[PDB]
Amino acid sequence: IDHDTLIDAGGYVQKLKLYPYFDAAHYVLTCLSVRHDLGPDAISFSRKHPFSCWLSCMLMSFAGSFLSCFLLGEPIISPLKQHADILLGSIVWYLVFYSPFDVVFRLATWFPVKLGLSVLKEVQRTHKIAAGVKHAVRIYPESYLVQILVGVAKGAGSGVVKIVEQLARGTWHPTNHEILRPSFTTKACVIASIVFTLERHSMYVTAPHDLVYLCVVGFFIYFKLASLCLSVHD
Amino acid sequence: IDHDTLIDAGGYVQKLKLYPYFDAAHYVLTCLSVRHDLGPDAISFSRKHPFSCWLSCMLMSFAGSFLSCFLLGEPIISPLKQHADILLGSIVWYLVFYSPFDVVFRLATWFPVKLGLSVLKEVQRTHKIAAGVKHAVRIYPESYLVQILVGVAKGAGSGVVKIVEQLARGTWHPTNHEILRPSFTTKACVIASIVFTLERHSMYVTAPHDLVYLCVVGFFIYFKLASLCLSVHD
Amino acid sequence: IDHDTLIDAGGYVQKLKLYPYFDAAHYVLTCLSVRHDLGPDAISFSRKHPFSCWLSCMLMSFAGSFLSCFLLGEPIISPLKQHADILLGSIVWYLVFYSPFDVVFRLATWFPVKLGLSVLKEVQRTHKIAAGVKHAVRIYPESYLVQILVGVAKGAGSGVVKIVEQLARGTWHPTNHEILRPSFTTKACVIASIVFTLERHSMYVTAPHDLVYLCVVGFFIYFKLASLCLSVHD
Numbered sequence: 001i002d003h004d005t006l007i008d009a010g011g012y013v014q015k016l017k018l019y020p021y022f023d024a025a026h027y028v029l030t031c032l033s034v035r036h037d038l039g040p041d042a043i044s045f046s047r048k049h050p051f052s053c054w055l056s057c058m059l060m061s062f063a064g065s066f067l068s069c070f071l072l073g074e075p076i077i078s079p080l081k082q083h084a085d086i087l088l089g090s091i092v093w094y095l096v097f098y099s100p101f102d103v104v105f106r107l108a109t110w111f112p113v114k115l116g117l118s119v120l121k122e123v124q125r126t127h128k129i130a131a132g133v134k135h136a137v138r139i140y141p142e143s144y145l146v147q148i149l150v151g152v153a154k155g156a157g158s159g160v161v162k163i164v165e166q167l168a169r170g171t172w173h174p175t176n177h178e179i180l181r182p183s184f185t186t187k188a189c190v191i192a193s194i195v196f197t198l199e200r201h202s203m204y205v206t207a208p209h210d211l212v213y214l215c216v217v218g219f220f221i222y223f224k225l226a227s228l229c230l231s232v233h234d
Numbered sequence: 235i236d237h238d239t240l241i242d243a244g245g246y247v248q249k250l251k252l253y254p255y256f257d258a259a260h261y262v263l264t265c266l267s268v269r270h271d272l273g274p275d276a277i278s279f280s281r282k283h284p285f286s287c288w289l290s291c292m293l294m295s296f297a298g299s300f301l302s303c304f305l306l307g308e309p310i311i312s313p314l315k316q317h318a319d320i321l322l323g324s325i326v327w328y329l330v331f332y333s334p335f336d337v338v339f340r341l342a343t344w345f346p347v348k349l350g351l352s353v354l355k356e357v358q359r360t361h362k363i364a365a366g367v368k369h370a371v372r373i374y375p376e377s378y379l380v381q382i383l384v385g386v387a388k389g390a391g392s393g394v395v396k397i398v399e400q401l402a403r404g405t406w407h408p409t410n411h412e413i414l415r416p417s418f419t420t421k422a423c424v425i426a427s428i429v430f431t432l433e434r435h436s437m438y439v440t441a442p443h444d445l446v447y448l449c450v451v452g453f454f455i456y457f458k459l460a461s462l463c464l465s466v467h468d
Numbered sequence: 469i470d471h472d473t474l475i476d477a478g479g480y481v482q483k484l485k486l487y488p489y490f491d492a493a494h495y496v497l498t499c500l501s502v503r504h505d506l507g508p509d510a511i512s513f514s515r516k517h518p519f520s521c522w523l524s525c526m527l528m529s530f531a532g533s534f535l536s537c538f539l540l541g542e543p544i545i546s547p548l549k550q551h552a553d554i555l556l557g558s559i560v561w562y563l564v565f566y567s568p569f570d571v572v573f574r575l576a577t578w579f580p581v582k583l584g585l586s587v588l589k590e591v592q593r594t595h596k597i598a599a600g601v602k603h604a605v606r607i608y609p610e611s612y613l614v615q616i617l618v619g620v621a622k623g624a625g626s627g628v629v630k631i632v633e634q635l636a637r638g639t640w641h642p643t644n645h646e647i648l649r650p651s652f653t654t655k656a657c658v659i660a661s662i663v664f665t666l667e668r669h670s671m672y673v674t675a676p677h678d679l680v681y682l683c684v685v686g687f688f689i690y691f692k693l694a695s696l697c698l699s700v701h702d
């Protein structure tokens with residue numbers, strides 16, 4: 001009965017209310033990333049330049065939406081009108097950098113938890129890509145390429161914003177073969193985006209959409225979990 | 235009677251017609267900055283690539299307006315439609331880089347003068363922030379955050395444009411602890427912006443607006459004059 | 469009879485249907501450039517990251533249009549709606565990086581051919597600038613400056629996009645006096661742009677427009693051919 005069960009699981013995941021737990025997971029991981037990139041002085045830095053620190057995290061937390069607006073010519077500022085989102089994001093940021101005894105940070109970096117957060121984040125990423133594709137389809141019905149790129153921007157735009165932040169923080173530097181970091185994330189966002197676009201135009205995808213959705217989420221979680229448990233071979 | 239006098243001084247400064255003297259002060263200082271950043275070959279460089287040099291100065295001279303348009307999704311080109319402004323800016327730029335015997339440059343870098351120009355510039359910056367907040371309020375009445383960010387963009391956006399220019403000129407490089415430059419400008423623009431935003435929504439500011447205005451300008455001039463007379467302790 | 473013949477040649481060149489041969493020439497040269505900038509591992513790189521490689525070439529192939537939209541506040545994505553163009557561009561890109569035995573690449577880099585392609589590209593660049601000016605004139609009838617800048621953006625915007633790509637690829641680095649590369653391209657686009665703008669407002673240009681057009685194209689081809697045959701003195 002798998003294929004009837006799987007179909008239900010897919011519709012299940014696809015209907016999950018992301019706010020506020022799946023969103024918070026993404027914010028937490030995003031803040032941890034900004035904190036890791038800030039260095040050993042991260043805490044001193046955050047206490048001396050809170051506005052800058054807060055900004056660095058908000059930009060990364062909503063990177064996909066900023067890039068998306070940029071591509072579509074919508075006010076870059078748009079995302080900041082999701083008051084609930086910005087508030088939740090600022091609270092997480094406050095907790096990650098300033099919780100007493102740094103408990104939040106310590107709890108979030110404990111492997112079992114970081115792993116649970118990563119799963120929730122992948123679920124949320126899949127939703128961002130799908131939403132991005134749907135939004136693009138409503139604006140440019142016949143532009144398959146735009147639809148795909150927008151979907152990818154919503155799912156992997158953090159890379160662009162990171163560069164922007166490292167330039168503004170004066171730390172950007174070439175990345176010419178320092179280490180071998182095998183990341184399939186953005187390539188996976190491309191595939192997911194194409195798949196959702198095709199699905200939206202009912203073409204090569206004859207499979208039940210709720211099942212395809214399950215597979216996309218499944219692959220995201222897989223590749224993500226693989227890189228977390230491993231280091232160089234999956 | 236101070237508080238009646240002060241109130242008048244505040245309304246006074248707030249009504250000052252910025253064009254063309256307060257504007258020219260800002261243009262002069264902006265051009266001097268681009269010239270200092272260009273190096274020893276600045277003059278040879280400017281004589282070989284005048285269009286590029288002119289562009290570098292216009293971008294910096296109107297940085298706040300370009301960033302503002304960028305954030306609001308308005309044509310980035312908008313600022314260039316202020317013919318009088320662009321003309322005055324181009325004239326100042328021409329004089330700073332090409333005046334015979336370099337008199338303009340020499341006069342502008344003479345401490346007493348550079349100090350007078352700095353005062354006028356701070357007065358103009360305060361007006362940019364306030365105007366930015368008002369503009370944002372008219373477009374997004376309930377978005378306090380957007381209003382603040384726009385105000386800050388109008389007051390401290392030159393930092394973004396500078397990076398853009400150093401990338402286009404091929405000179406950008408990390409700024410990892412070369413020297414200890416204590417600049418409170420942008421942090422002050424943040425405060426000023428918040429204050430004007432609050433003031434616009436008549437909340438925590440029970441003080442006479444014209445008096446608050448005086449304080450903001452006063453603090454800008456102070457922090458600015460402090461950094462000019464000092465080097466590492468104020 | 470030259471001046472009657474020349475006038476005809478000018479109207480001639482100006483009416484040339486750019487698609488698909490003049491366009492393909494530009495795409496081919498653009499792809500060769502991205503390939504040269506990718507290095508010795510270019511081929512391995514392209515086979516491991518095709519989506520990224522394809523993107524790098526599309527961004528450069530339509531750089532002028534992306535910058536133009538950016539300046540005018542039009543959706544940055546707009547250019548991708550020229551399906552025929554994007555298809556032709558993707559096909560050229562596919563052929564340049566993956567043709568069997570690399571014949572396309574080998575044929576395109578054979579001096580006589582690269583020289584022929586360069587001529588066609590210069591013809592196309594002239595058309596981009598003129599189109600850019602006309603577009604700007606229709607939107608902002610009295611903004612001479614905007615009209616000129618837009619024209620220049622359409623003709624020399626690839627420089628901006630290149631920087632963007634080197635940042636995203638993690639290879640950007642200062643260009644502080646490594647070699648002496650004498651490029652007059654963008655300075656020539658500035659002149660061409662001013663000339664077309666003036667021409668559009670029927671001012672200082674009393675010369676037959678079709679003749680001026682011929683001269684502009686002629687100068688582009690000249691400066692371009694000069695740099696190709698030479699290395700340091702023309």
Ligand SMILES: CCCCCCCCCCO[C@@H]1O[C@H](CO)[C@@H](O[C@H]2O[C@H](CO)[C@@H](O)[C@H](O)[C@H]2O)[C@H](O)[C@H]1O
Binds near residue numbers: 052386417424
């Ligand atoms: C409720 C809304 C509150 C948020 C409002 C908007 C927040 C303001 C964002 C800009 O913050 C700036 O960030 C810079 C860093 O990019 C700091 O540069 C300072 O700190 C840097 C390092 O972080 C140094 O490199 C610089 O030299 C030094 O000037 C600067 O002080 C700070 O003001």
Ligand SMILES: CCCCCCCCCCO[C@@H]1O[C@H](CO)[C@@H](O[C@H]2O[C@H](CO)[C@@H](O)[C@H](O)[C@H]2O)[C@H](O)[C@H]1O
Binds near residue numbers: 083
């Ligand atoms: C100097 C920077 C400091 C910024 C301070 C400004 C904060 C302004 C908050 C005013 O509106 C808030 O809206 C929140 C929602 O966004 C509410 O949260 C409550 O309501 C939300 C739903 O509206 C739920 O999500 C929350 O979990 C629940 O705590 C909260 O009660 C309410 O006061």
Ligand SMILES: CCCCCCCCCCO[C@@H]1O[C@H](CO)[C@@H](O[C@H]2O[C@H](CO)[C@@H](O)[C@H](O)[C@H]2O)[C@H](O)[C@H]1O
Binds near residue numbers: 028104107108
């Ligand atoms: C990175 C480290 C992680 C940071 C740590 C912060 C985690 C916060 C855990 C919140 O746990 C929630 O607590 C709610 C109470 O606030 C519960 O509400 C539920 O139970 C309440 C009673 O306890 C009822 O009043 C509510 O209506 C019912 O929704 C809800 O089930 C539970 O998930």
Ligand SMILES: CCCCCCCCCCO[C@@H]1O[C@H](CO)[C@@H](O[C@H]2O[C@H](CO)[C@@H](O)[C@H](O)[C@H]2O)[C@H](O)[C@H]1O
Binds near residue numbers: 016112
């Ligand atoms: C530290 C890492 C480990 C953390 C793992 C815990 C994650 C907690 C996030 C909770 O997410 C919620 O899950 C609910 C279910 O429990 C969903 O109920 C929803 O979905 C159900 C079906 O799955 C329906 O039956 C319900 O009616 C409907 O409210 C709801 O949308 C979703 O926000």
Ligand SMILES: CCCCCCCCCCO[C@@H]1O[C@H](CO)[C@@H](O[C@H]2O[C@H](CO)[C@@H](O)[C@H](O)[C@H]2O)[C@H](O)[C@H]1O
Binds near residue numbers: 402655658
């Ligand atoms: C009335 C309106 C008039 C203004 C119209 C628009 C002005 C044109 C802006 C672009 O100017 C370009 O600036 C580049 C610099 O960013 C120069 O690069 C040249 O100079 C650089 C150094 O400044 C070098 O690094 C480069 O290699 C070299 O090609 C290039 O020659 C020049 O054309």
Ligand SMILES: CCCCCCCCCCO[C@@H]1O[C@H](CO)[C@@H](O[C@H]2O[C@H](CO)[C@@H](O)[C@H](O)[C@H]2O)[C@H](O)[C@H]1O
Binds near residue numbers: 317322
């Ligand atoms: C190759 C680059 C060279 C660019 C040359 C193109 C210049 C075009 C100027 C034509 O319009 C100008 O407008 C100026 C105003 O912007 C006037 O200045 C006069 O009028 C202004 C007010 O309109 C005052 O601000 C000035 O101080 C006063 O000199 C000036 O008379 C007038 O000719």
Ligand SMILES: CCCCCCCCCCO[C@@H]1O[C@H](CO)[C@@H](O[C@H]2O[C@H](CO)[C@@H](O)[C@H](O)[C@H]2O)[C@H](O)[C@H]1O
Binds near residue numbers: 341342
């Ligand atoms: C960085 C180095 C600084 C660069 C040096 C350039 C400074 C230019 C100084 C201008 O001084 C102005 O001269 C005006 C004359 O052009 C005067 O007009 C005034 O006086 C004129 C008579 O002199 C009358 O005709 C006018 O109506 C009356 O407005 C005005 O008061 C005075 O401020």
Ligand SMILES: CCCCCCCCCCO[C@@H]1O[C@H](CO)[C@@H](O[C@H]2O[C@H](CO)[C@@H](O)[C@H](O)[C@H]2O)[C@H](O)[C@H]1O
Binds near residue numbers: 246254346350351
């Ligand atoms: C080298 C550095 C040292 C330079 C210092 C000199 C600065 C000169 C800038 C002149 O600024 C003007 O000041 C006028 C006053 O003199 C103002 O008159 C205006 O404001 C007055 C009140 O202050 C009113 O009484 C007037 O009617 C009204 O025209 C006018 O707006 C303003 O542009």
Ligand SMILES: CCCCCCCCCCO[C@@H]1O[C@H](CO)[C@@H](O[C@H]2O[C@H](CO)[C@@H](O)[C@H](O)[C@H]2O)[C@H](O)[C@H]1O
Binds near residue numbers: 149183
């Ligand atoms: C029909 C439409 C198809 C096109 C859809 C959109 C194409 C997707 C564009 C982004 O492609 C990304 O480019 C990155 C490069 O900028 C790659 O980074 C990888 O490769 C880089 C080198 O090229 C390394 O520096 C990075 O560390 C490494 O993660 C990444 O894998 C790849 O996904």
Ligand SMILES: CCCCCCCCCCO[C@@H]1O[C@H](CO)[C@@H](O[C@H]2O[C@H](CO)[C@@H](O)[C@H](O)[C@H]2O)[C@H](O)[C@H]1O
Binds near residue numbers: 551552556
């Ligand atoms: C995974 C990435 C792979 C992408 C595959 C998607 C391609 C979709 C193609 C469908 O429409 C195409 O339009 C082309 C035009 O753009 C046509 O070319 C033909 O028609 C054109 C004019 O429409 C001419 O320019 C061409 O030379 C001629 O081959 C072609 O027949 C037709 O099928």
Ligand SMILES: CCCCCCCCCCO[C@@H]1O[C@H](CO)[C@@H](O[C@H]2O[C@H](CO)[C@@H](O)[C@H](O)[C@H]2O)[C@H](O)[C@H]1O
Binds near residue numbers: 572576
């Ligand atoms: C960088 C290396 C370069 C890459 C190599 C790819 C170059 C492709 C060459 C195409 O040559 C074209 O072939 C067409 C045929 O497909 C001809 O059509 C013409 O001749 C055909 C018969 O051969 C007729 O059917 C057509 O109607 C008539 O338009 C056309 O004249 C000719 O220019």
Ligand SMILES: CCCCCCCCCCO[C@@H]1O[C@H](CO)[C@@H](O[C@H]2O[C@H](CO)[C@@H](O)[C@H](O)[C@H]2O)[C@H](O)[C@H]1O
Binds near residue numbers: 483490580
């Ligand atoms: C490897 C480098 C060397 C490659 C050099 C070969 C370049 C081939 C590109 C062909 O460009 C076409 O030339 C046609 C002429 O042959 C033009 O016919 C057009 O223009 C003619 C006038 O020039 C008119 O008579 C025609 O009716 C009209 O169709 C047409 O627009 C244009 O696309």
Ligand SMILES: [Mg+2]
Binds near residue numbers: 131
């Ligand atoms: Mg949704």
Ligand SMILES: [Mg+2]
Binds near residue numbers: 365
């Ligand atoms: Mg005003």
Ligand SMILES: [Mg+2]
Binds near residue numbers: 599
């Ligand atoms: Mg045309």
